[PDB]
Amino acid sequence: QVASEYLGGPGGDAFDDKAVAQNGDITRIEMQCTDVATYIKLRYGKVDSRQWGWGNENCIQWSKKGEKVVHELSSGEYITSAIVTYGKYVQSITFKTNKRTLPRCGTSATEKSVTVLIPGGLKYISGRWGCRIDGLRFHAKC
Amino acid sequence: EIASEYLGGPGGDAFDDKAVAQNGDITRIEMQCTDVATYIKLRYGKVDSRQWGWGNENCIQWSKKGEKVVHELSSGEYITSAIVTYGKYVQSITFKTNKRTLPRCGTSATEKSVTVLIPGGLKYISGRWGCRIDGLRFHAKC
Ligand SMILES: OC[C@H]1O[C@H](O[C@H]2O[C@H](CO)[C@@H](O)[C@H](O)[C@H]2O)[C@H](O)[C@@H](O)[C@@H]1O
């Protein structure tokens, strides 16, 4: 389907949730949040994707870790907007749904900002990951 | 139907291309481009909408007019996103298709920017118009 540009840097390893997303619409958002967002993990239908970020606990060598933030989406709720601050890594992620606006993951919002609107709801994410979220791309439903 | 939020201000007159878009998929983008985008007029199949913007030549007493820009879409080419900078009016529009990123209409990109994904390709637009493009909504195919 249609996707956004890649937002982020060249580090890490590529991931793409296209296949796991075929299990269903996003039902849950999980992130690890401190002054930056350190991982993202979505659930597609009943099927969690991988933890994309915070590859192992020794990543504390290079960044704060943060706390786990879970937002369960209700039936018929979908993400219509992503505000992402980023440079060589994703710094922060603020999601809005057709039902409500979620708190930003990442308290610092100092990097360049981009707002991506997804009519009909975000289908899935791809990007690059390691100790952090090197980059994100947003994929619509067709 | 899947459609983006309305991007713009409350001035002008509402337009909606729903009916004229029954004439077919979008085959051409026509705009008027200066420091800002001053009208848009898409072609559906062989049939154009009315000109949405630059209502009359006295509009030069409020803003610059600009030059006609035409992008012909190849068959099977469809519009997949738009970067829109906007405030009281639409300032600039940068259309992207499944085949290429097109030139910006509107050299100034200084107001609020958003990247609208248009899942499945752009079906038609609606919005508000007058001397300028007061605002736009993008209607997606799926
Ligand atoms: O622990 C190994 C390395 O961890 C960091 O680098 C990784 O994580 C980054 C953010 O996800 C990626 O950009 C990078 O490509 C990964 O290797 C850290 O920056 C390095 O110093 C460590 O060697």
Report yes or no: A40 and A133 within 8 Å, Cβ to Cβ. Answer: yes
State the Cα–Cα distance between residues A122 and A102, nearest whole angstrom: 15
- CB atoms near residue A119 (< 10 Å): 25
- B116 CB neighbours in chain A (<8 A) are 117, 119
Ligand 1 contact, A135 CB (< 6 A): no
Amino acid type, B67: E
Breaks in chain B (C–N beyond 2.5 Å) sit after: none
B30 token code pair: 């026509």
Query: Which atom of ligand 1 is found nearest the CA of A58?
Result: 1
CA distance B119 to B52: 23
Burial of A109 (0-12, 13-18, 19+ CB in 10 A): middle
Query: Of A117, A92, A94, A120, whose CA–CA distance to A106 is shortest?
Result: A92
B119·A142 Cβ contact <8 A = yes
Q: Which residues of chain A are at the B interface, by a Cβ-Cβ cutoff of 8 Å? A: 1-5, 80, 114-120, 138, 140-142
Resolution reading in Å:
1.7
Distance of CA B69 to the CA centre of its chain: 12
Hunting for tokens 């004439």 — which residue is that? B23
Question: Gap positions in chain A, given as the residue before each gap (C–N > 2.5 A)?
Answer: none
Experimental method: X-ray
Rounded to a whole number of angstroms, the CA Rg of chain B reads: 14
Q: Which domain holds residue B130?
A: 1-142
Q: How many angstroms is it from A129 CA to the middle of ligand 1?
A: 9
Q: How far is CA B91 from CA B36, B51, B60, B96, in A?
A: 5, 17, 16, 17
Of B127, B129, B139, B141, nearest to B6 (Cα)?
A: B127
Q: What are phi and psi of B58, to 5 degrees?
A: -70, -10
Rounded Cα distance between A44 and A19, Å, is 10
Q: Is B115's CB within 8 Å of A120's CB?
A: no
Cβ A41 vs Cβ A52: under 8 Å: yes
- Identify the H or E element spanning B135: strand B133-140
Beta-bridge mates of residue B53: B39
Give dist(CA B69, CA B35) in Å, integer.
13
Number of domains chain B contains: 1
Residue B50, judged by CB atoms within 10 A of its CB (0-12, 13-18, 19+), counts as exposed
Give the residue from B5, B10, B79, B90 showing the smallest Cα distance to A97. B5
Q: Do B142 and A138 touch (CB under 8 A)?
A: no
How many Å apart are CA A28 and CA A83, to the nearest integer?
Answer: 18
